[model samples]
Target: YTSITKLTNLTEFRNLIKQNDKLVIDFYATWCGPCKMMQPHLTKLIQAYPDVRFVKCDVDESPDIAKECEVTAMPTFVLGKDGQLIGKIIGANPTALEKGIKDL
Candidate 1:
């Protein structure tokens, strides 16, 4: 299976947050360019740190996930640490993307 998971609902969102130590939730929408561009680097990082959690959710499909998560824009990279949350906006910069993951 691919390392990045498409969380289907809120329950799965909370579940992964609880299950993983360093959770990174990629909040993106279908047809969003920047989010689309991120796929390649996302693969590199997913394997770069196998222990970290990588998941995705579509804002259009699951606004509730974005609502509670404070997502204002598509392709917002949200990080959850031990049940707590934070957001980092790194839109499609493979350099910034990898840096954000490493900084995690």
Candidate 2:
């Protein structure tokens, strides 16, 4: 029920998140196992959150772009707002990750 957009440029990503709210950014890599597990849930989450926008940045595709988000690990869920980088979860199961969405 959702169509997510992916980015390869840091500048565009900054603008995308800056104008957005409860924005969730997936910093993932194709070589990573956990990143694969999150795809189904990520799509599910996007449909549930009416006020949120989801973006995925592939590390392998754009390592330089993903670098600015301080991505040191795969499957990192980064949530940011206009002034705050509010949520940064390195490794989350579905439940913990979902709780973060509502709390933030």
Q: Write the residue-wise lDDT of candidate 2 on 1-104 in tens digits.
A: 12678887877887887788678888888767888888898888888887888888888888886677788888888888764788787864778778888776
Give TM-scores for every candidate, taking all chains together and pairing residue i with residue i. Answer: 0.88, 0.87
lDDT of each: 0.79, 0.79
When superposed on Cα atoms, how far off is each prediction in RMSD? 1.8, 1.9
How many clashing pairs in candidate 2? 0
Clash pairs, model 1 backbone: none
lDDT of 1 by residue, 1-104 (tens): 24568888889988888898788888888889888888877787888987778888889999998898888887888877678785475566677666666766
Estimate candidate 2's RMSD in Å.
1.9
